[PDB]
Ligand binder design. Structure first.
Ligand SMILES: CC1=C(C(=O)O)N2C(=O)[C@@H](NC(=O)CCC[C@@H](N)C(=O)O)[C@H]2SC1
Ligand SMILES: [Fe+3]
Length: 275
C-alpha cells in the first residue's frame, strides 16, 4: 500500500510542529530524512575529500602503521591493500594519518554524534519515553562511525535491522543514478538516495525496545550494482551507529515480540551479551 519516505526539519520538530505525523512515521515506517540538524553537505564532502586523499597518496608505510590491528574489533582502515575501502572511529583509541586529518575527522565525528543525540532525544520526547537512569545518561553512550568509499571511475545479502538506537546515513550519489540503499516500507522496497542537505535516519532495534514497542526498526539492505551497472558507480556512505553503553537493559519477552534473532535465555538481558 504505502511506500513513501517522509522528510523533517529537526528545528521545526523541537518547536512542537508536526507532532502527529512524526509520531505515526515512527510507529508505521521507522525511517526518515532530516534537515536543519547542524550537518552540512560541505562538511561531509570536505571529510570525504581528505580520506580519498590518503587512499590515493599514502605510502605502504603510513597505511600499515594505521591499518586495523585486530581486524574485527573496529578502528582504522580495511580493504586498501594490494572493491571497498573503509574507515572506522569511536569515542577514543582512534588511529590517524596526519595532524590535520585528526582535527577534521574528530570534528566530523562530534557533529555527527551531537546530531544523533538530538534526533534520538526527539524520538523519546515524542513517544513520551524516559529511559531508566535518564534521557541524558542513555544518550551519553558508546557510538561508532563507519565510512565506506567504493572507488573506480554478484552476491545478494539479506535485509537486516540495525543494532542501534538510531543510525544516520550521509551518502554521496553515483554519477549514474543507482541507489545502493533500500528498505521495507509498507510492504515494499523503496530507494533511499542522496538527498541534498538531508540525512537519512533509520530507527534501530534499541529504539523499538526502549519505547515499549512504540517505534519500528525497518529491515534494510545494501545492494551492489549488477555486472552491467558498473561504469559511473563510485559512491560513499557515512554511517553513524548510535549504540548504547554495554549495560543498557531490556525485558526479553518484549524483544522477540518484534522478530529479533536472540539466542539467549533468562529474565532480562544487556546490550553487551547480545553483540
Ligand atoms: C550498515 C552496515 C554496513 C554498511 O557498510 O553500511 N556494513 C558495515 O559497516 C558492517 N559491519 C560489519 O562488517 C559486521 C557485519 C555484520 C553481519 N554481516 C554479521 O556479522 O553477521 C556492514 S553491516 C552494517
Ligand atoms: Fe545497516
Amino acid at each position: 500500500m504505502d511506500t513513501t519516505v517522509p522528510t523533517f526539519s529537526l528545528a521545526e520538530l523541537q518547536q512542537g510542529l508536526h507532532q502527529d505525523e512524526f509520531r505515526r512515521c515512527l510507529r508505521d515506517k521507522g525511517l526518515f530524512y532530516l534537515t536543519d540538524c547542524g550537518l552540512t553537505d560541505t562538511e561531509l564532502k570536505s571529510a570525504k575529500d581528505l580520506v580519498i586523499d590518503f587512499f590515493e597518496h599514502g605510502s605502504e608505510a603510513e597505511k600499515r602503521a594505521v591499518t586495523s590491528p585486530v581486524p574485527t574489533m573496529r578502528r582504522g582502515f580495511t580493504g586498501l591493500e594490494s572493491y571497498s575501502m573503509c574507515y572506522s572511529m569511536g569515542t577514543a583509541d582512534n588511529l590517524f594519518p596526519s595532524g590535520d586529518f585528526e582535527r577534521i575527522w574528530t570534528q566530523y565525528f562530534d557533529r555527527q554524534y551531537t546530531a544523533s543525540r538530538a534526533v534520538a532525544r526527539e524520538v523519546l520526547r515524542a513517544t513520551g519515553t524516559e529511559p531508566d537512569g535518564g534521557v541524558e545518561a542513555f544518550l551519553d553512550c558508546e557510538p561508532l562511525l563507519r565510512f565506506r568509499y567504493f572507488p573506480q571511475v554478484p552476491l545478494r545479502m539479506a535485509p537486516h535491522y540495525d543494532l542501534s538506537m538510531v543510525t544516520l546515513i550521509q551518502q554521496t550519489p553515483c554519477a549514474n543514478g543507482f541507489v545502493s540503499l533500500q528498505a521495507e516500507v509498507g510492504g515494499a522496497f523503496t530507494d533511499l538516495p542522496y538527498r541534498p542537505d538531508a540525512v537519512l535516519v533509520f530507527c534501530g532495534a534499541i529504539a523499538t525496545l526502549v519505547t515499549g514497542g512504540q517505534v519500528k526498526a525497518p529491515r534494510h539492505h545494501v545492494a551492489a550494482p549488477r555486472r552491467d551497472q558498473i561504469a559511473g558507480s563510485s559512491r560513499t556512505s557515512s554511517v553513524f551507529f548510535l549504540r548504547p553503553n554495554a549495560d543498557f537493559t531490556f525485558s526479553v519477552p518484549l524483544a522477540r515480540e518484534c522478530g529479533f534473532d536472540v539466542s539467549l535465555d533468562g529474565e532480562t538481558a544487556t546490550f553487551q551479551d547480545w553483540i
